[PDB]
Design a protein around this ligand. Structure first.
Ligand SMILES: Cc1ncc(C[n+]2csc(CCOP(=O)(O)OP(=O)(O)O)c2C)c(N)n1
Ligand SMILES: Cc1ncc(C[n+]2csc(CCOP(=O)(O)OP(=O)(O)O)c2C)c(N)n1
Ligand SMILES: [Mg+2]
Ligand SMILES: [Mg+2]
Lengths: 537, 537
């Protein structure tokens, strides 16, 4: 038995639990897409654009562990670049497959077939341009391993001619080894003895779980770490959802000066900060920084020491190192909103506190860069809730695509999980057509649109009335029907009373259909803290 | 007297006639953005996205001579690249200005601030990172001239801190030299002379005008060449609109073996070809290639001999060298469709033939990659018709953004110049949000949407009923209102009779409001030409 190189890929993909592929068909990927339908459990999303396809793979990747997007030579691959750059910046393993001329139009007129390939080489961990079938399987295996292991995008260029040549089916019987290289014995020992040492001498140690806490596997090792030690644990905004917000040792989200004052202090008064997975913004004492391929203790750098090993080892001796610890109280959780008349115009501060009431365990919460990403940091999540916020890259159309990707993976995990989006009126415009793909597949997300008439976040820092910070007003509610939706629901909310009425409805809380909920907000309204700093800034 | 570097940029643009600026605001471009408002007659489009705005910037240039797109570091720039590559491949003068962090987040997290610049350099004629106000003005002036003169994209990184820095206002009173340099005389002579000689011996000469005849401003000279020689004139697809088609010595669209038979015959049988050509993507040995920077006479290349002056100079002598040419019969125009009952379903073939009748002088015709770029070649254009067809880059979606741009340019040339767009339903999906911007500015293009339920060009090549060839079915007549159009018109045509009643209607022929026309076409229907090329694709 043989299999085509093309089916081979989808089969391996399925081995790593990639069931949905993103991208758009083109002149050089057609023969390869045919293969998707010869493998069971696999489906082609049929995205509305390549940039949007890149964004979805990213989101799906964030939920499932990896993703795949197929594009065509030039036109398709160059449109995805901003998505792949953001996956690269934030550590999302996205495998980007591109169909290329037949080892032989959508060219810069110069005869150069490697330009695009070399452009991507800048935002990838590794690149493969496949030219021989005898080497293909290994090559493909290699790109999948890398994407998955490093949680970085890989470019896999695949000529149209080779997708059709046969490869031994036998190859698939041997799984791709995803196991890491051990560390330098002497430096991993150095790091381990030193941490245990710091721990034994710290009176007020704190744990901070960042961005990569969960992408890099360590979410489990991080929760074990909390229980064993009993130190107060905090998430930074990129790590929100990494720690179950209902854990007694859960102390809050640490943003710097934007934090709730009691949170800011609890972290800042700490004599040891244990930091897991920084893409760090962050008096603050001795900081042990844990990164997937390096540690840092204080000012010292141990290049090459992977956190996985250090963390599996620490767990056998931490309870002991720490048995001298006297639990410190954690900052009390922000109290419920005061009762106000139902007429009360919606304000974000009210809203973000208020939202926590709507959320349930297993929710997928996506927040777009704008005042949306700032406000979500104020929402107390139930346990087992995943947060998505593109704080480092910060590409405004991101989330419409992320939501599709995330919904597709949720659907594969448990059709009962909910996908909630919080996106600004201005950002919805960059990537609106992706709502089309959700409808096509019967995905049922909650799309909340912050209608505040333009870009309030840039207005808060420069040109409150600069024409460039305004946009064409859209009739948001007609989006669903314009894109051929069938089973849907739209809603408008402008007051406290309306939020409640709809968010407390039992049918509402059920993901029976795709829904759009327009939120009416004042142009200059944002989370409190952001207005104080923004003003005097 | 001093002006800020930011305002100098806009002043110099005003001076080169770039009156509309494409792009999106962001982190690194706001103070620049503010200068646009201080310069009288200048305007900021406010695009729905960066891909879109590139597409738009390309559109504008095609009509006006050059254009300018303003983006932001990382996120803005990476998103425009498919657009910019597109301009590179087809020789379109786009100055991409990117606003970057001061000489010192939307980063790859590695502290490389030269990465995006490095990616742009492969699809740029020249690049510039401004770091000194001593030379800044000189850099800017240079970049604009290159964009202009080469008709190729240019990348200008402009650090946020420098934008507000002062410059002698006096530098503006001296105009950038936007003029081509005069040829080396001896070489120029050599060419002229042999051209003249060879013209004198040809019994059947032919003139062919390709992409660059339009792109590189030789439009007017080619025309007068045809009048003065009375040699048959043929265009290629990229060059359609390059020759005024109601000219008695104009014989058709040459597209090789796929050309109307007598078109093959008339061209193939020439004993001399004056290719007022372009982009060398390719009877006798007797070929004269005219190129923006060089000439080729048979096997003899003359580096640095610019067709512009060869042509001008040839017009002072050519008719004489030809006084003895007995004019060969030019191939016949295809006859008008035979009258059919009102009720006949529309067919593409009857359609492109008939369009020739609604079409008027000075119109802007945009036809998107799919059946539309194919069918347009079968349409007879009035004289002075500007056509836009991305034959070489072929990025579906391009047209929506370019329509925005062509329209801003068309309004600057003359408010009564009509802009007509043929886009497939598949393609619209990719750049749909750009209709918003059109509505924002009260622009009045004709948006024709070929509804044929999917990607019929693609289906006709591979997998007729493959799921990847199908689209989510949208309600197109709702787009205008959904994007907030107040004054517009929508229409749907499915028969010959409907086509006609609409297209002959006097108030419909006047660009009074923005209109959308859905064309109802059968799935597998395509122009005779795609029906022939297809075999082999
Ligand atoms: C692709 C891209 N272009 C430009 C920017 C710059 N930018 C940052 S936030 C923003 C406005 C987003 O506004 P909206 O979604 O309405 O959020 P709000 O603050 O109003 O809730 C813009 C244009 C960006 N981040 N990404
Ligand atoms: C950005 C990009 N993605 C993919 C392609 C490949 N592609 C070429 S034609 C086509 C379908 C065009 O569909 P439509 O506009 O519906 O045309 P028609 O039905 O008139 O043929 C696609 C997906 C491309 N050229 N550019
Ligand atoms: Mg907004
Ligand atoms: Mg179609």
């Amino acid at each position: 038995s043989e299999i085509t190189l093309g089916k081979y890929l989808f089969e391996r993909l399925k081995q790593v639990n990639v069931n949905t592929v993103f991208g758009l068909p083109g002149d050089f990927n057609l023969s390869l897409l045919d293969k998707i339908y010869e493998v069971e459990g696999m489906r082609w999303a049929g995205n509305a654009n390549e940039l949007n396809a890149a964004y979805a793979a990213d989101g799906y990747a964030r939920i499932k562990g990896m993703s795949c997007i197929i594009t065509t030579f030039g036109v398709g691959e160059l449109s995805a670049l901003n998505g792949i750059a953001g996956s690269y910046a934030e550590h999302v393993g996205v495998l980007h497959v591109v169909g290329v001329p037949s080892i032989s139009h959508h060219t810069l007129g110069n005869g150069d077939f490697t330009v695009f390939h070399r452009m991507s080489a800048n935002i990838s961990e590794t690149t493969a341009m496949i030219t021989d079938i005898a080497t293909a399987p290994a090559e493909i295996d290699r790109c999948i391993r890398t994407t998955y292991v490093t949680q970085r995008p890989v470019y896999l260029g695949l000529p149209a001619n080779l997708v059709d040549l046969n490869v031994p089916a036998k190859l698939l019987q041997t799984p791709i080894d995803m196991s890491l290289k051990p560390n330098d014995a002497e430096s991993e020992k150095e790091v381990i003895d030193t941490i245990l040492a710091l721990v034994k001498d710290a009176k007020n140690p704190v744990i901070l779980a960042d961005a990569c806490c969960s992408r890099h596997d360590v979410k489990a090792e991080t929760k074990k770490l909390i229980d064993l030690t009993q130190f107060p644990a905090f998430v930074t905004p990129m790590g929100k959802g990494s720690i179950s917000e209902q854990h007694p040792r859960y102390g809050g989200v640490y943003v710097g000066t934007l934090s709730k004052p009691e949170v800011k202090e609890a972290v800042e008064s700490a004599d040891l900060i244990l930091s897991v997975g920084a893409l760090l913004s962050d008096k603050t004492k001795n900081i042990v920084e844990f990164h997937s391929d390096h540690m840092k203790i204080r000012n010292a750098t141990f290049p090459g020491v992977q956190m996985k090993f250090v963390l599996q080892k620490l767990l056998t001796n931490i309870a002991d190192a720490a048995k001298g610890y006297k639990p410190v109280a954690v900052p009390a959780r922000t109290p419920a909103n005061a009762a106000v008349p139902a007429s009360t115009p919606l304000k974000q501060e009210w809203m973000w506190n208020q939202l926590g009431n709507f959320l349930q365990e297993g929710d997928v919460v996506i927040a777009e860069t704008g005042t949306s990403a700032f406000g979500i940091n104020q929402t107390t999540f139930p346990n087992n809730t995943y947060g998505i916020s593109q704080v480092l890259w910060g590409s405004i159309g991101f989330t419409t695509g992320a939501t599709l990707g995330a919904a597709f993976a949720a659907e594969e995990i448990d059709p009962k999980k909910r996908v909630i989006l919080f996106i600004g009126d201005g950002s919805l415009q960059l990537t609106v057509q992706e709502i089309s793909t959700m409808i096509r597949w019967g995905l049922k997300p909650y799309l909340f649109v912050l209608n505040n008439d333009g870009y309030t976040i840039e207005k808060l820092i420069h040109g409150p009335k600069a024409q460039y910070n305004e946009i064409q007003g859209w009739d948001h509610l007609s989006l669903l029907p314009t894109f051929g939706a069938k089973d849907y629901e739209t809603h408008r909310v402008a007051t406290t009373g309306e939020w409640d009425k709809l968010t407390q409805d039992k049918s509402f809380n059920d993901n029976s259909k795709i829904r759009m909920i327009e939120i009416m907000l004042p142009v200059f309204d944002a989370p409190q803290n952001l207005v104080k700093q923004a003003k005097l800034t």
